[PDB]
Design a protein around this ligand. Structure first.
Ligand code: NA
Length: 376
């Protein structure tokens, strides 16, 4: 009698954590939720109340080095196809006698898309990062693929992808299949989406609200640094700076610590950000999102190209300064920190963005929108 919603993802934190609360909420509303997942994340998934449906994925495990996921475009993308080809039959079999009413999936799951179509039920894509805007194909996708696509390997990748879709009754081009879902909930704030003005809001809905430690007395400004020489620059930057208190998430090669510095291997990030006045971050999604949700200005120290994207966005919003690790020295860190925490306009902008995020809604709204897709 309860509707059966089948969620699909892979064993990667960034492709599971962002929708965990949505899944929990759907279970709380009485829906029967199953969640296709590799065994390493069975416990994680079961904790939401959803039933794990186990399958073997050939993608790197959640603890693998980022290098394992590849350095080139083809190296990054082929694994998702290879995985999908071998995962599809496993999942088809697992669900054969219990076809769901609706398919939910993280963007990485090609099998979810295929099965939704095979089963004749709606699919809802859940994006943990930015989505395509109108013009993306000409502006980003085509230029990006222009060279690899014309190589032998590239031609054979796309040939293989087309054939696989053809074997499952799909005639959409693989680029459409992969990058252009019919319906998507975007789990990042619109503020972190490039060209958000050209995103098709009949397809995509931004639901980026941040639905997902004690400040020392005498601390007038609290700075959290989260994700060597850089940590020591931070110690020199904030150590014994009057009124400041530094929380360093990093481990005895930092040297002697001043009294206003505390170091942890792990910290409750969101809990500290609620009581923090500055956040030094690598500017991945999540970090960027929690900074905005807590109206905490940021020093963005990006390294992995997308972070350079988030960082430029944040800096474009006037709520962060982007620094290279070459610039990330004590004097510049301190100067930047003083300038950001003392700027009433930075604070005003953060309040605006925080309010916009609240309006997007998060968990409750996402669950509503998923229910609205129940062919019902
Ligand atoms: Na804050």
């Amino acid at each position: 009698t309860p509707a059966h919603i089948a969620m699909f993802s892979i064993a990667a934190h960034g492709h599971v954590n962002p929708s965990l609360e949505v899944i929990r909420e759907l279970v709380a509303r009485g829906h029967r939720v199953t969640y296709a997942i590799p065994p390493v994340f069975a416990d994680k998934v079961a904790a939401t109340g959803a039933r794990p449906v186990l399958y073997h994925s050939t993608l790197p495990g959640p603890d693998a080095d980022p290098e394992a996921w590849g350095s080139t475009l083809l190296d990054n993308v082929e694994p998702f196809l290879n995985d999908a080809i071998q995962a599809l039959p496993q999942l088809a079999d697992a669900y054969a006698d219990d076809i769901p009413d609706l398919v939910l999936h993280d963007i990485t799951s090609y099998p979810a898309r295929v099965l939704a179509r095979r089963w004749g039920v709606p699919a809802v894509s859940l994006s943990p990062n930015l989505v395509a805007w109108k013009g993306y194909e000409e502006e980003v996708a085509e230029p990006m693929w222009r060279e690899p696509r014309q190589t032998e390997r590239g031609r054979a990748y796309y040939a293989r992808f087309e054939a696989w879709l053809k074997e499952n009754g799909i005639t959409e081009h693989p680029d459409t299949f992969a990058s252009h879902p019919p319906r998507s909930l975007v789990l990042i704030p619109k503020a972190l989406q490039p060209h958000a003005d050209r995103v098709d809001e009949d397809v995509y809905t931004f639901v980026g609200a941040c639905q997902g430690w004690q400040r020392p007395a005498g601390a007038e400004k609290v700075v959290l640094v989260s994700l060597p020489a850089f940590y020591r620059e931070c110690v020199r930057a904030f150590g014994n700076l009057p009124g400041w208190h530094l929380v360093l998430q990093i481990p005895a090669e930092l040297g002697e610590l001043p009294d206003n510095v505390e170091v942890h291997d792990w910290v409750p990030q969101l809990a500290i950000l609620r009581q923090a006045d500055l956040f030094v971050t690598h500017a991945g999604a999540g970090g960027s999102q929690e900074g905005l949700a807590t109206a905490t200005p940021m020093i963005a120290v990006p390294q992995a190209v997308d972070q350079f994207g988030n960082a430029d966005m944040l800096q474009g919003l006037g709520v962060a300064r982007k620094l290279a690790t070459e610039e990330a020295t004590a004097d510049l860190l301190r100067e930047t920190a003083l300038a950001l925490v003392d700027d009433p306009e930075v604070a005003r902008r953060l309040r605006r963005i925080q309010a916009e995020m609240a309006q997007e809604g998060g968990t409750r709204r996402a669950a509503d929108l998923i229910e609205a897709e129940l062919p019902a």
